[PDB]
Design a protein around this nucleic acid. Structure first.
Length: 831
RNA sequence: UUGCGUUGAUAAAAGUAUUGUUUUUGUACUCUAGAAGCUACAAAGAUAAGGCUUCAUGCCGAAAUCAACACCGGUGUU
DNA sequence: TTTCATTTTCTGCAATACTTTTATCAACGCAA
DNA sequence: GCAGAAAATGAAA
C-alpha cells in the first residue's frame, strides 16, 4: 500500500504519491487551471443589464412612433426636420399653439429624456437644488435659460459666476416632466381637437413607465427564464418568492414568515420552556395574556410571570440577554400591531388566513404587488377595497415588523411540534431528537467513485469550489489507475470536504485515513509529514462566445503621412482635455514627432500659430489662468474654445467593420480575439500550414439561429490564410493545448503550450508559451531550427519552415502524455 | 448538530439615470452666395459582431462545466 | 548598387449616480 | 496581458 498527498493553492493543484515501507516517489503532477474569480460574472451581468436599458430606450421611441401613427395625426417620419431647438418649442408649448410636427418633436425630445424616479450625498445636494429651483418654473425653462445664458446645457459642467462657481447637472425628477407634459398637452387640447384624453393617458404611460423591480424581463408571449413569466408555463407574480429557502427537516416545503401566528406561538412557547423557575394551564393563561393585553414590553410580562409564580426576579435562568442590556423575550408584537387596525378584526379570523396574510405582507412591498397577491392568493377571500388600502398603508407605516425575514422551520414542522410542547417541558432540540426527525437528507447515486456534485454544493466562494472539484477529479483518476490507498492528506471551509471524504470512506468500508512546480515539491513535503520527471497537465479552454474585441469605436481618413507617396486609410486618434498634464504630454509627443500629423495643421493652419505662441512663451494651464480658454483665431476675440485635437495614429490593418449606411469614412473596431488553429499538411511542398479562427468569425445563422461557421466561409478563410485545397487536415489546437515540434535533421524536439495565431499578414506565425513556467524572462535559447526568444517577453517564432514536424500531445489528469498525429477527414464546425 | 436575537462580509438575480466614443445635419468661426468638415455647441442614428416571432410594461449574445476514440453504471486502446 | 521578405519592439485598452429582494458564512450571548 | 503595426533587420536581384 501507499500514501497520497495533495496540495491545493488558489489556481494550481499538485500531487505526490509515496511509499510508506520504502521511501520512494511513484508519481508527481502539477495541474494548472485559471482561478475563476467573480469579476467576470460581474462584467457579464453588468453588460446584460446595460443592453436591456438601451433596448428599452429604443423601444420607447418606437412605441412613440406607433402612438403618433395610430391616432391619425401624422404619417411620414422621414420628412421631419431635425435642426430645431426642442426646448424653445416646449416653452412655446406652455403658451400657444404648435403644429403636429412641432408637437411631435417636442414630445420626442421629452420621451428621450425623462428623469430619476426613486424619490416619489454630493449628488443628492445638486438634484435637490434643481428641485428647489423647480418650484416656480418648469424644467424646460431651466434648460432653455441655461442654454440662452451659457451656451451649454448637456452633462455636468462648471459655470463661471462673478465671485464663485457651481456645477450644473441635467438631472430632474420625473414628476417635473409629468407636470410639464400635462400642462403642454392641456394647452394643445385647448387649441387642437385631435388630441384625445386616451392619447395623453398612453403618452404619460410611455413617458413614466418603469417595470417594477420584482417583475423582471418578459411578457405573456416572451417566456424568458429571468422574470415572472417562465418557460415551463407558470407565472410567478413575484420572482423572489421562488428563491425562498426550504425547511430543515421537510425538504419539500418553503419556510414560514417570521411575522405569522404559528412562528410567534412557537417562539414564545420555546422561550418560556427555556426559563427555569411551568405547567400547561400557566402556558395557556400566559399566552392569552400576551395575546390580549396591549402596549407591554419584556419587563411587564416578567412582572406578570413573577405575579403568577409569587416570587421575586431572582435565580431565574434561561432569560435571553441582549448586549449590555436587560432581559428581552418574545412578545406578539406583529399580532398586536395588526390588532390596531379598524377596518378589519384579527381575533376571530383563523390561523390559516393569518399565516397566508403574513406571507403576502412579508413578501411584497409596493401597492401593486400587495394588491395582486391579496387578489390572487386568497381563494374565497373576497377582501374589500378599503380593507386592501388600509392593509397597504399599514405595511407602509410599519416597515420593521414586516422586514425581519423568514423563519427556519416550515409550518408543518412547527404545527407538529406545538401540541407536543404544551404538556412536556422540553425544548425543540429534545422533542425533535426524541421523535426521530433528524434526517435532512441530500445525496446522489454512485457505485465506485467519489461524486463532485454533492460535495461542491457547499458554496463559500467559487474559487474554493473550483479548486475542490479539480482535487476530487484527481483523486478519482488516481483511484482508478492505482486501485486503493492507505492515507490521503489534503492541504489547502475544509470541514465539509473532510466530512464528505470520511463519509465516502465510511460508507464503502475502506480504511483510508483522511488528514489535514514548487507545489508538487510541497505536496511531497506534506505527504512526508503524514526535477526533470515533473510532468504537467493543463486545462483546455474551448468555449466559443467570449469577448470578441475592444470597445472603443474608431474613425478613418485617407491621407498621406510621412515618407509615403500614396493614399492609404489611417485610423484617427484624439487628445481630449488638452489642459490636463496627460493631454499636454501627448501633445508634446505628437509635436516633437511630426507636426503635420495633426488635422489642425492641414485645415485652418493660421490658428496653429496662435497655438504656437503659449508653447513659445511660457503648459496651457498657465494660459488658462492668464486669459482663459484658448480661442480659434478670428478678427475679434469671438473665436470658439479649443479643448481637443485629432491626429493620425497608424495605418489600417486587421479589423471588424461596423460602418453605418450614410457614412463617407470607414468605422472600425480593433484588437480582435482569437479562438483556435488548424494545422494542415501540404504533400507537394512538404510543409505545414497553420490556419486560425477568431471569435468574430463564428456567428448566429439566419436560418435557424444556431451558432456555427459555414463551409464557404471556411474555404474563404482557407484561401486568405494561404493554405492549399488539396491538403490533409491534421488536427486542431485550442488554448493551452500542448504541442510537440521536432526537426528532421538533428531530431531534437520541444513541446510548448499553444496560445494564438498572431500577425495575420505574415503567414504561419504562432504565439506559444512555456511548458513549465509562463513568463519567458528575457531570451532563453531554443532548438537551433527555431532560434532565440525575443528580449521583451513575448514569443512568436515561425512555423511552416521546411524539414520540421508537428504532433499534438494530450495529457490526462495525472499527466501521462499521448502523442497523436492525425485526427479526422474534416474539421468539426457544428457544436 | 438544531433554534432565537443582534452586526459585519460576500454571492446570485432584478429596475433606472446622466455622460463617453462615433456617423449625418444645422448655427458660429476661417478663406474666396460658395468652399473646407478643422474648433465649439445643439438635434437625430449606432453602442460588443450578430439573431428570433408573438407586434410589444417584446426577447437572446462577454460566467462555470474538460484527455480523447472504439467494443460489450462498468469495460479496452495511442 | 536598392528592395523585399522575415524577426523584434512598443504603445494602448469605457465610466458614473441611485432603489430592492433572496441566500450563505463568521463572531457574541440564551437553551440540549 | 496581449493584438498588431512600426521600426529594424538580413538576403537578393
Amino acid at each position: 500500500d501507499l500514501v497520497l498527498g495533495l496540495d491545493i493553492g488558489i489556481g494550481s493543484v499538485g500531487v505526490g504519491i509515496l511509499n510508506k515501507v520504502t521511501g520512494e516517489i511513484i508519481h508527481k503532477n502539477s495541474r494548472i487551471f485559471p482561478a475563476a474569480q467573480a469579476e467576470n460574472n460581474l462584467v457579464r451581468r453588468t453588460n446584460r443589464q446595460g443592453r436591456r436599458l438601451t433596448r428599452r430606450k429604443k423601444h420607447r421611441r418606437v412605441r412613440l412612433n406607433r402612438l403618433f401613427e395610430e391616432s391619425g395625426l401624422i404619417t411620414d417620419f422621414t420628412k421631419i426636420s431635425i435642426n430645431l431647438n426642442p426646448y424653445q418649442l416646449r416653452v412655446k408649448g406652455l403658451t400657444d399653439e404648435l403644429s403636429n410636427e412641432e408637437l411631435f418633436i417636442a414630445l420626442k425630445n421629452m420621451v428621450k429624456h425623462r428623469g430619476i424616479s426613486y424619490l416619489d450625498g454630493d449628488y443628492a445636494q445638486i438634484v435637490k437644488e434643481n428641485s428647489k429651483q423647480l418650484e416656480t418654473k418648469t424644467p424646460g425653462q431651466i434648460q432653455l435659460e441655461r442654454y440662452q445664458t451659457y451656451g451649454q446645457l448637456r452633462g455636468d459642467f462648471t459655470v463661471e459666476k462673478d465671485g464663485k462657481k457651481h456645477r450644473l447637472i441635467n438631472v430632474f425628477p420625473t414628476s417635473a416632466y409629468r407636470s410639464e407634459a400635462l400642462r403642454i398637452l392641456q394647452t394643445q387640447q385647448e387649441f387642437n381637437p385631435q388630441i384625445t384624453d386616451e392619447f395623453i393617458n398612453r403618452y404619460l404611460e410611455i413617458l413614466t413607465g418603469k417595470r417594477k423591480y420584482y417583475h423582471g424581463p418578459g411578457n405573456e408571449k416572451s417566456r424568458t427564464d429571468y422574470g415572472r413569466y417562465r418557460t415551463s408555463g407558470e407565472t410567478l407574480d413575484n420572482i423572489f418568492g421562488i428563491l425562498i429557502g426550504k425547511c430543515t427537516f421537510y425538504p419539500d416545503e418553503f419556510r414560514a414568515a417570521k411575522a405569522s401566528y404559528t412562528a410567534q406561538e412557537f417562539n414564545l412557547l420555546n422561550d418560556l420552556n427555556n426559563l427555569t423557575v411551568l405547567s400547561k394551564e400557566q402556558k395557556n393563561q400566559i399566552i392569552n395574556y400576551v395575546k390580549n393585553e396591549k402596549a407591554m414590553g419584556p419587563a411587564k410580562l416578567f412582572k406578570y410571570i413573577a405575579k403568577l409564580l409569587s416570587c421575586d426576579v431572582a435565580d431565574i435562568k434561561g432569560y435571553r440577554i441582549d448586549k449590555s442590556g436587560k432581559a428581552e423575550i418574545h412578545t406578539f408584537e406583529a399580532y398586536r400591531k395588526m390588532k390596531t387596525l379598524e377596518t378589519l378584526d384579527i381575533e376571530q379570523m383563523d390561523r390559516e388566513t393569518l399565516d397566508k396574510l403574513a406571507y403576502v405582507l412579508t413578501l411584497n412591498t409596493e401597492r401593486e404587488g400587495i394588491q395582486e397577491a391579496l387578489e390572487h392568493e386568497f381563494a374565497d377571500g373576497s377582501f374589500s377595497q378599503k380593507q386592501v388600502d388600509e392593509l397597504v398603508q399599514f405595511r407602509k407605516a410599519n416597515s420593521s415588523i414586516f422586514g425581519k425575514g423568514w423563519h427556519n422551520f416550515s409550518v408543518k414542522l412547527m404545527m407538529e411540534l406545538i401540541p407536543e410542547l404544551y404538556e412536556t417541558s422540553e425544548e425543540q432540540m429534545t422533542i425533535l431528537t426524541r421523535l426521530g426527525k433528524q434526517k435532512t437528507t441530500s445525496s446522489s447515486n454512485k457505485t465506485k467513485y467519489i461524486d463532485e456534485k454533492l460535495l461542491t454544493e457547499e458554496i463559500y466562494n467559487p474559487v474554493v469550489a473550483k479548486s475542490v472539484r479539480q482535487a476530487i477529479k484527481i483523486v478519482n483518476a488516481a483511484i482508478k489507475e492505482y486501485g486503493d490507498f492507505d492515507n490521503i492528506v489534503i492541504e489547502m471551509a475544509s470541514r465539509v470536504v473532510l466530512n464528505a471524504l470520511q463519509e465516502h470512506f465510511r460508507a464503502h468500508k475502506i480504511d483510508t485515513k483522511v488528514s489535514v512546480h514548487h507545489h508538487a515539491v510541497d505536496a511531497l513535503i506534506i505527504a512526508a509529514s503524514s526535477e526533470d520527471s515533473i510532468l504537467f497537465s493543463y486545462q483546455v479552454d474551448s468555449k466559443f462566445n467570449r469577448k470578441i474585441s475592444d470597445a472603443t469605436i474608431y474613425a478613418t481618413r485617407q491621407a498621406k503621412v510621412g515618407k509615403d507617396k500614396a493614399d492609404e486609410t489611417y485610423v484617427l486618434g484624439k487628445i481630449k482635455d488638452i489642459y490636463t498634464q496627460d493631454g499636454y504630454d501627448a501633445f508634446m509627443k505628437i509635436y516633437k514627432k511630426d507636426k503635420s500629423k495633426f488635422l489642425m495643421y492641414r485645415h485652418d493652419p493660421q490658428t496653429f500659430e496662435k497655438v504656437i505662441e503659449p508653447i513659445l512663451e511660457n503648459p496651457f494651464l498657465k494660459y488658462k489662468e492668464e486669459h482663459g480658454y484658448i480661442r480659434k483665431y478670428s478678427k475679434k476675440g469671438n473665436g470658439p474654445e479649443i479643448k481637443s485635437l485629432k491626429y493620425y495614429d497608424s495605418k489600417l490593418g486587421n479589423h471588424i467593420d461596423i460602418t453605418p449606411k450614410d457614412s463617407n469614412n470607414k468605422v472600425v473596431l480593433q484588437s480582435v480575439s482569437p479562438w483556435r488553429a488548424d494545422v494542415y499538411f501540404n504533400k507537394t511542398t512538404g510543409k505545414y500550414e497553420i490556419l486560425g479562427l477568431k471569435y468574430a468569425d463564428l456567428q448566429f445563422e439566419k436560418g435557424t439561429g444556431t451558432y456555427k461557421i459555414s463551409q464557404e466561409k471556411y474555404n474563404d478563410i482557407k484561401k486568405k490564410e494561404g493554405v492549399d485545397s488539396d491538403s490533409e487536415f491534421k488536427f486542431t489546437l485550442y488554448k493551452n493545448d500542448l504541442l510537440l515540434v521536432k526537426d528532421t535533421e538533428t531530431k531534437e524536439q520541444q513541446l510548448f503550450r499553444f496560445l494564438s495565431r498572431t500577425m495575420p499578414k505574415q503567414k504561419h506565425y504562432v504565439e506559444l508559451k512555456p511548458y513549465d513556467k509562463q513568463k519567458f524572462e528575457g531570451g532563453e535559447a531554443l532548438i537551433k531550427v527555431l532560434g532565440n526568444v525575443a528580449n521583451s517577453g513575448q514569443c512568436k517564432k515561425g512555423l511552416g519552415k521546411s524539414n520540421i514536424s508537428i504532433y499534438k500531445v494530450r495529457t490526462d489528469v495525472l499527466g501521462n502524455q499521448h502523442i497523436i498525429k492525425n485526427e479526422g477527414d474534416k474539421p468539426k464546425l457544428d457544436f
